[PDB]
Amino acid sequence: SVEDDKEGHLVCRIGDWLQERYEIVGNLGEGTFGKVVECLDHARGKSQVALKIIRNVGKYREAARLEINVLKKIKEKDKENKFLCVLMSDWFNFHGHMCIAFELLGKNTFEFLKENNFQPYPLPHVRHMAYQLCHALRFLHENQLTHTDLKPENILFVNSEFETLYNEHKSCEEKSVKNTSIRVADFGSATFDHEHHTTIVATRHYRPPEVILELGWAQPCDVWSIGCILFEYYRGFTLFQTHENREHLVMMEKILGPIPSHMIHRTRKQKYFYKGGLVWDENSSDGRYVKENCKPLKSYMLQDSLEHVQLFDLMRRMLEFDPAQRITLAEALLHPFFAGLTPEERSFHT
Numbered sequence: 423s424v425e426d427d428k429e430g431h432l433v434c435r436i437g438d439w440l441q442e443r444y445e446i447v448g449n450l451g452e453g454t455f456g457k458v459v460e461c462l463d464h465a466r467g468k469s470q471v472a473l474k475i476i477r478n479v480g481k482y483r484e485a486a487r488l489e490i491n492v493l494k495k496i497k498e499k500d501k502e503n504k505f506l507c508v509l510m511s512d513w514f515n516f517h518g519h520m521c522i523a524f525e526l527l528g529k530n531t532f533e534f535l536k537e538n539n540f541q542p543y544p545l546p547h548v549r550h551m552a553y554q555l556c557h558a559l560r561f562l563h564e565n566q567l568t569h570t571d572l573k574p575e576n577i578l579f580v581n582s583e584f585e586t587l588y589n590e591h592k593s594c595e596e597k598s599v600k601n602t603s604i605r606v607a608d609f610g611s612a613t614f615d616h617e618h619h620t621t622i623v624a625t626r627h628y629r630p631p632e633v634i635l636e637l638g639w640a641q642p643c644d645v646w647s648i649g650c651i652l653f654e655y656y657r658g659f660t661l662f663q664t665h666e667n668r669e670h671l672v673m674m675e676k677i678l679g680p681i682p683s684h685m686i687h688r689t690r691k692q693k694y695f696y697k698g699g700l701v702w703d704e705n706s707s708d709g710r711y712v713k714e715n716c717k718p719l720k721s722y723m724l725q726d727s728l729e730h731v732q733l734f735d736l737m738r739r740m741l742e743f744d745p746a747q748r749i750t751l752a753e754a755l756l757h758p759f760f761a762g763l764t765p766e767e768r769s770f771h772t
């Protein structure tokens with residue numbers, strides 16, 4: 423009495439049971455991996471649980487086993503749960519679907535943005551969110567770990583309740599989240615220093631130049647992702663709205679300046695260059711799109727004030743082409759931008 427999609431997915435409806443324990447009461451989301459559903463845990467007193475239900479397919483089962491492993495390791499090294507990673511409470515195999523139970527949190531920061539008409543988070547929210555991202559990922563980075571798949575969808579508000587405001591300048595309503603506490607989620611791609619590193623990681627929009635150019639990667643990959651995320655929080659649109667490598671590299675140059683020549687000498691992806699310059703068709707669709715839409719980083723600042731100038735300096739440093747010269751999260755946490763945190767934000771007491 424258990425059935426699947428043509429692809430992996432478990433067919434299930436509201437009211438279904440799993441492990442004589444988890445009652446499904448809602449659908450929360452869908453990913454490439456499978457499905458996430460709200461459940462009530464009838465062993466811990468009807469307590470709410472986000473239940474990630476993985477496709478009955480080898481690739482994905484493998485990834486989920488790897489995720490369980492990483493969450494196990496994080497839990498060993500952060501028993502106090504001070505480093506803001508989503509809390510795994512249980513895992514199991516249910517008819518070939520790996521299932522992982524997590525603490526129920528609110529909406530992810532992509533969905534909040536979307537439900538807010540892609541109107542950006544205000545700077546104080548961007549700062550607090552950036553701080554927590556830096557804090558959480560420094561911890562994984564010092565424990566020989568790289569997330570690799572950092573993006574707004576994988577950052578979740580603990581509670582996404584909002585208050586509705588009216589913007590005078592913009593003549594419209596704006597949702598402003600009441601508590602900016604977040605957690606980091608989805609460790610299905612996370613990789614230890616000693617494990618094999620695939621040539622290509624991260625979803626395209628959050629992918630660093632060392633990956634595209636196949637120079638190898640490690641923790642600096644996450645730092646680049648974080649810089650794209652911060653930008654996306656602050657403007658509400660994606661920094662590199664791209665779908666192929668050459669375009670992406672052109673956008674990196676239009677936005678950040680020339681790719682350093684040492685990376686160009688090192689890469690085996692010489693088809694992207696000629697005499698040390700990027701080569702590309704300015705008359706194609708991608709060409710015209712990039713020319714119309716991608717401008718230098720600083721031109722996207724919304725205010726002139728110090729806190730804004732500092733955000734952009736930090737971002738600029740997170741988006742350094744050379745992963746060896748890119749700012750580390752330990753250093754990021756000391757950037758003067760975080761001066762503006764409230765003491766409560768700095769100590770993680772909301």
Ligand SMILES: CN1CCN(C(=O)C(C)(C)c2ccc(C(=O)Nc3cn4cc(-c5ccncc5)ccc4n3)cc2)CC1
Pocket residue numbers: 448449450451458472474508524525526527528529530578582583607608609
């Ligand atoms: C559909 N309805 C939409 C309307 N609702 C809501 O506006 C509330 C505020 C009640 C709500 C919204 C979203 C969540 C949620 O989506 N929460 C979650 C996902 N989620 C996903 C991982 C996760 C992922 C991927 N890999 C690992 C873990 C972990 C925790 C986690 N919490 C909850 C409440 C009710 C729901």
